[PDB]
Symmetry: C4
Subunit: 245 residues, 4 copies
């Protein structure tokens, strides 16, 4: 149990550091940051996390992915709290890590103040916030479908009965999938397909002086990246089992 917790903590921390840094690069600097880099930062950050903890715990790095495996009988329910606790600690510490490494850049870009919304907003480095045009229930649809897209492809990639990725190379294919999810479907909600990617960094920003507007922004958008991916991952998983399986 301890080894599984440590594996999930380290794998989530590695992935979240790479993902949050790429978002920080895009938000803070123009000539060093791009949306493609954000997709590459999050996508291949998963690949490093898979190498870290793929054999010990499976490197879920995702509360929705862990929930789907537990709800589909692949992983015992008694390990679900341990996986989520490991991912939440790893993401929270990754957010603190990015804050320390980019503290001067965040202060220089924003100008001392930490604003959730505005032209110098820096809260979006850590958590995802709904755009102006999009609505909460459209964001729920986007979050669930994107997590279902990930879980269906995740099952196909690592299904030994089906056509799998070559063992020892599945980490790269998983990273490619995360890269193209952000590329193709990630502009509507910030593709927070991971509840561990969204809430722990949001809790950090509230503590780190960004204020309570992190939760109240977008008509209380904060809960959607926590609940919608769980439904989407479950739905994406059962569809694969019914159709392909």
């Amino acid at each position: 149990m301890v080894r599984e917790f440590l594996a999930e903590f380290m794998s989530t921390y590695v992935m979240m550091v790479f993902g949050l840094g790429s978002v920080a690069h895009m938000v803070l600097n123009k000539k060093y940051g791009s949306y493609l880099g954000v997709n590459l930062g999050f996508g291949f950050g998963v690949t490093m996390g898979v190498h870290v903890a793929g054999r010990i715990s499976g490197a879920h790095m995702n509360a929705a992915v862990t929930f789907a495996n537990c709800a589909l009988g692949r992983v015992p329910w008694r390990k679900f709290p341990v996986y989520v606790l490991g991912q939440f600690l790893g993401s929270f510490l990754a957010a603190a890590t990015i804050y320390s490494l980019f503290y001067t850049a965040i202060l220089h870009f924003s100008g001392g103040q930490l604003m959730v919304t505005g032209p110098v907003a820096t809260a979006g480095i850590f958590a995802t916030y709904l755009p102006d045009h999009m609505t909460l229930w459209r964001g729920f649809l986007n979050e669930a479908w994107l997590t279902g897209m990930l879980q269906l492809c995740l099952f196909a990639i690592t299904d030994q009965e089906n056509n799998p990725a070559l063992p020892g190379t599945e980490a790269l294919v998983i990273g490619i999938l995360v890269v193209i999810i952000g590329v193709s479907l990630g502009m509507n909600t910030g593709y927070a397909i991971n509840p561990s990617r969204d809430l722990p960094p949001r809790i950090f920003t509230f503590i780190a002086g960004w204020g309570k507007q992190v939760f109240s922004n977008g008509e209380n958008w904060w809960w959607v990246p926590v609940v919608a991916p769980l439904l989407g991952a479950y739905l994406g998983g059962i569809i694969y089992l019914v159709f392909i399986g």
Copy 2:
């Protein structure tokens, strides 16, 4: 037969969702969309589809590719209607999926109206439309050569007698080929090398309120991405068999 139909439906749906989303990103948003992302979205969307249905049906995901295999004796002719029906349903539902996920973005960008042509045109997200400078018969040449380029390389990648891609990794190499086809030869016609990629999304847009101009645009360009890839894929296939084989 049912399993083969389901495999082609799911693999086409996964690939088309990734491909159409990347096109939607490029069309709707500047800071989140790029032509390279479109090539990455379509290219590695194929890779996910190959993992989904490569062992069950071969993951053709392409009516031209299916036609070439059937016309060259590799796949029975009786399965051609099943493969095409699966790909057409998967592409049509993928177009509806992209419409729902990007409905607010499409409405915000266009301004409520759905126009095939103009500065706020949104019909190009789903189907390919001929540019102003290019002609229909030049588009026929581009569509046939590009599909022949794909089919010749597809045969080489998955030819066990020749120098193949390593089994279990052929999905990545296939995705790379689709990425570089859009990069190098995809600006002239939108590289609709797949009849399933073009017609079903075009039928959806006509139903979804874009009007009958989807078919009448470009001097009735709609039929070229359906007929030209079939001739190109066949020609690309026989050339590989004669020369390399």
Copy 3:
């Protein structure tokens, strides 16, 4: 001998079509072409060519690479004319292919005239031309070092005694090497590390109506991409054999 000639012709044609198209995209269109796409177009165009002819002829696709192998005893000298003839025909026909597929785009961009130099120059799509600041003998240094960089890495990638790329995946690693050669060292001379990539497209443009300025441009620069890579590839090869071997 015939099979080896056909393998070199087809592999060069596939690679050169992808490479020239990516250059055409960058030259003709801004929103669809980028220097990174040119590196991706040429780099992974090699990968497709390796899958085509890697087992039959080794897929040299490069007169300098063929010369180095022949001069280092790895390939018989009697096959050198056959490899070069195959690569020259494949590159010449690839240039004609790109001319037909981009004829309307080239005419629209240039405005009917075909100019070697100027703001609407289109001769650089096919052959490489020296920039204004660079000199001929500095270009000779760049061409030889870049080909030596390629040949040293090519030997390391496909050296079974050394640490090789995994068999069946060496095509991807070769393509990666070509991608990063253009990324890191390709802006000074256009990284025409292949004599087959430079001269046959230059001969085509002279025939295709661009005039005799294709050869006289840059103080008769045309011969440097033919002679310098041969010296560079040989020097890069012997260095690897002495040091690593």
Copy 4:
């Protein structure tokens, strides 16, 4: 000992040539250079170096990585001076190589003068310099954490007891890790995670006429990329051994 020295010299030279060229492209040219290309240039330059010397010496190509292996008992201490001497010579000669290949471009861009700081600064092509907003001790934190991130992931990728990358393909995964380190965390200090990447090119620029300001810039920043990565690599290594091991 001689073979190990030659392997480290050649592998470092290959990687540093690709890395420095990509930085030169970004600094000197806008339409041919980008920050993503710099990450690709350094990242997959490591991959070529791994193929060169991975079996002979392990292809550390990094004084911090060599120090961590020696301090953790994986590599004898008597070989540490040989690895560092090989990497320092390979990086110094790579800097001279880039100077010769880009001499006309550097002269044209800067205008004859070689300035460490200013709008036409060219000293950043070879060595990393602290930005205006960042401080020396914040740079120390960035350099140590980034090297710890690399070493922890490097151990996971090449840990046969853990979940490894597939043998024969570990070079690509190592290159991917270096690519995403620059993408996500490389804008604060230039991600000089390698003491061999920083000091030898800095010594070259001082000799090559850039003056003594290369060492005095940023309140004597030159020593931080030499000392901080050693502490970071050691700390990143022991953490992996305690937690994952």
